[PDB]
Amino acid sequence: ITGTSTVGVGRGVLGDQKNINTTYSTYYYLQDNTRGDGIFTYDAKYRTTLPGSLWADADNQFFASYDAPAVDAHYYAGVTYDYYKNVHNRLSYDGNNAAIRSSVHYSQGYNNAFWNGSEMVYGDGDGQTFIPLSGGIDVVAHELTHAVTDYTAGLIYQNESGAINEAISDIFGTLVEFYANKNPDWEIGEDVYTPGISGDSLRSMSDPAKYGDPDHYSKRYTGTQDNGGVHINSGIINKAAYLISQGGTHYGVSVVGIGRDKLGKIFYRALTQYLTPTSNFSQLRAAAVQSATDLYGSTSQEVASVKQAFDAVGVK
Ligand SMILES: [Ca+2]
Ligand SMILES: [Ca+2]
Ligand SMILES: [Ca+2]
Ligand SMILES: [Ca+2]
Ligand SMILES: [Fe+3]
């Protein structure tokens, strides 16, 4: 669309008010011209054909409940873009300011969200297991990070490489949650998961075992479900990442925490410089150690903490 940049206001899934970047051209559209080649949000109108219609509104106010998920998807994508740019100096997911597109109201009662190789897609949930998934900034950032991985390391979506791909999305989705300071935690999807149950989440990075995911290499899943457990075995890497950041003693191995910022710097470098499509956990460890070495010196505490953390989860 060609028009005038402007700012509208609406309410998100959780009921919070926010301003969003819109474009005016007869209608007000969910098209943000202020970030790279634009952020565009579309209405999939409960169908599965994609992307749907670019979101159009008559008055630049988005307070209808049908609007909620579009508001959050649109807003959270901007935040995520900002994170990458500000923090890592990366322009959009491709590093070249590619347009970011998302569709909401995908299908009916769809309890998931995903990156389809071209854009993001969000379900509204069934209202019981989930509410519209774009209401969780960690979910939005998790999805956009899959784009980042596709353009960089290109980790194949299965077995260990796939678990790495998933851990990357949880790690950066969490870093983005802290970046925006939106009630941050080391949990995944807490804000849109089981509206009825307080205190739970989809996955835990601090204690993956809480939900039955492995927190040690010896406990990895070796079967075929879930593409070889990409969503399960990511727990081992997630735990490692939590330890690197926060520190702790796990299975008797003590790790000194070095903080979130450094965690992000080290993982981003590994991702972008050292990982390949078929990298396995053991290769990830080598990569993370090399990155930290690059950044902080081989005799650094940083390097030391990365080593301990992997030893702690049993990754050699
Ligand atoms: Ca309106
Ligand atoms: Ca949170
Ligand atoms: Ca979270
Ligand atoms: Ca819940
Ligand atoms: Fe994922």
Distance CA(120)–CA(103), nearest Å, equals: 6
Experimental method: X-ray
From residue 182, alpha-carbon distances to 9, 71, 88 in Å are 19, 16, 20
The pair of three-digit structure tokens given for residue 151, joined into one six-digit string: 């353009």
Residue 72 lies in a domain: yes
Taking the centre of ligand 1 as the mean of its atom positions, its distance from the CA of residue 10, in whole angstroms, is: 8
Residue 1 lies in a domain: no
Residue type, 72: D
Q: Which ligand is nearest to the CA of 187?
A: 3
Give, for 141, the enclosing helix (H) or strand (E). Answer: helix 137-151
Distance CA(240)–CA(236), nearest Å, equals: 6
Distance CA(19)–CA(112), nearest Å, equals: 26
3-state SS assignment for residue 223? coil
- Chain centroid to CA 278: 21
Using CB atoms within 10 A of its CB, is residue 98 exposed (0-12), middle (13-18) or buried (19+)?
middle
From residue 297, alpha-carbon distances to 170, 230, 292, 315 in Å are 27, 32, 7, 22
Distance CA(112)–CA(125), nearest Å, equals: 7
Whether 231 is a known active-site residue: answer: yes
β-strands 113-115, 53-54: how paired? unpaired
Q: Considering the candidates 143, 160, 250, 302, report the single residue annotated as catalytic.
A: 143
Taking the centre of ligand 4 as the mean of its atom positions, its distance from the CA of residue 131, in whole angstroms, is: 10
Q: What is the largest CA-CA distance in the chain?
A: 64
State whether 168 and 284 are in the same domain: yes
Residues annotated in a binding site for Zn(2+): 142, 146, 166
Among residues 154, 174, 203, which one ends one of the domains? 154
Strands (E), the chain: 4-11, 17-25, 27-29, 31-32, 39-43, 53-54, 56-57, 61-62, 100-104, 113-115, 120-122, 187-188, 203-204, 247-250, 253-256
In the chain, how many domains are there?
2
Backbone angles phi, psi at 228, to 5 degrees: 85, 25
- Bridge partners (DSSP) of residue 5 are 23
Q: List, in order, residues 6 or more apart from 34 with CB less than 8 Å away.
A: 5, 21, 78
* Segments in 14-90 forming alpha helices (H): 68-88
Resolution in angstrom units? 1.8
Taking the centre of ligand 2 as the mean of its atom positions, its distance from the CA of residue 191, in whole angstroms, is: 6
The pair of three-digit structure tokens given for residue 52, joined into one six-digit string: 């749907």
CB distance 84 to 94 below 8 Å: no
CA angle (70 as vertex; 45, 125 as ends), nearest 5: 65
Among residues 154, 182, 217, which one ends one of the domains? 154
Helix and strand numbers, DSSP H then E, in the chain: 8, 15
The full length of the chain comes to 316
Per the listing, tokens 């996955």 go with 203
State whether 149 and 278 are in the same domain: no
CB distance 205 to 166 below 8 Å: no
Does the CA dihedral 285-291-292-297 come out positive or negative? positive
State whether 128 and 259 are in the same domain: no
What residue numbers bound the domain in which 274 lies? 155-315
Taking the centre of ligand 5 as the mean of its atom positions, its distance from the CA of residue 224, in whole angstroms, is: 17
CB distance 231 to 157 below 8 Å: no
Whether 119 is a known active-site residue: answer: no
Distance CA(207)–CA(214), nearest Å, equals: 9
CB-side exposure of 305: number of CA atoms within 13 Å? 24
